[PDB]
Amino acid sequence: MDKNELVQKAKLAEQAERYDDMAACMKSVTEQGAELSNEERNLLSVAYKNVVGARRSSWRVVSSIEQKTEGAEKKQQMAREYREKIETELRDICNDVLSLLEKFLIPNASQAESKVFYLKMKGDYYRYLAEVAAGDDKKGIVDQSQQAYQEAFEISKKEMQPTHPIRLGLALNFSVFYYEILNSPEKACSLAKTAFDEAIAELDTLSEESYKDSTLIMQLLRDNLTLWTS
């Protein structure tokens, strides 16, 4: 009921691996209208990542099965219908997150760190809608994802250090957007490489707190470069 009580409840749900309970708790905290602490922001993000992620993973298995059944018209129809059922769940999750971002999280974000984080998150959830969209609505959704990422990108470039894990994480996800959604491997590689190289160049300005996360994300950036290069 109370804010602090809902946060302790979310942490308990996290430990129980009951992420729908966790998402419900952090949604309620967000809806109280106060700016989320760094802890609360991370709890919200973890909760919804796991809720949407379960559907994404399932949709990837059912869509793959649907495509890899040629002659079975009845079996393919079942897979198609189950895929659509899963899509509807996924869309409702994404729309709940995107509504929270638009109504509470983005307008209340009083620091560049926070604003970049939430705009990146907006980019991610429009990207998850884009993964699942049919041709008519897809171009619009893809553009919404790109615009969110692009605004996040410009703010992080202006306000944040190249080694900042949120700036690096944005570069990772935006490069993935270009590769997987926009089919633009050259743009994806150049964004990823530039982010990696800028972090390498400013290796002095990197504190002992965000020293691990930063270097882990840099490794992921370069892993994508080597993968996409072949």
Nearer to its own copies, 61 or 227 (CB): 61
State the residues that interact with Ca ion by CB under 5 A: 18, 20
When CB distances are held under 5 to 8 angstroms depending on the partner's kind, the choice from its own copies, Cl ion, Ca ion, none that residue 151 binds is none
Q: Please answer whether residues 48 and 25 qualify as being in contact, where contact means their C-beta atoms are separated by less than 8 angstroms.
A: no
Nearer to Cl ion, 12 or 216 (CB): 12
DSSP string, 166-198: HHHHHHHHHHHIIIIIS--HHHHHHHHHHHHHH
The three-class DSSP label of residue 2 is coil
Q: Select from 193, 178, 48 the least CA-distant residue to 122.
A: 48
| Binding status of residue 29 toward its own copies by CB under 8 A | no
Dist. CA 200–CA 194, nearest whole Å = 10
| Binding status of residue 206 toward its own copies by CB under 8 A | no
With a CB cutoff of 8 Å and minimum separation 6, the contacts of 205 are 161, 163
> What is the total count of residues that contact its own copies (CB under 8 A)?
21
Q: Select from 153, 176, 24 the least CA-distant residue to 100.
A: 24
Nearer to its own copies, 13 or 166 (CB): 13
Interface of this chain with its own copies, residues 52 to 111, rule: CB under 8 A: 54, 57-58, 61-62, 65, 74-75, 78-79, 82, 86
Nearer to Ca ion, 18 or 187 (CB): 18
Please give the residue ranges that form the binding site for its own copies (CB under 8 A).
Answer: 5, 8-9, 12-13, 15-18, 54, 57-58, 61-62, 65, 74-75, 78-79, 82, 86
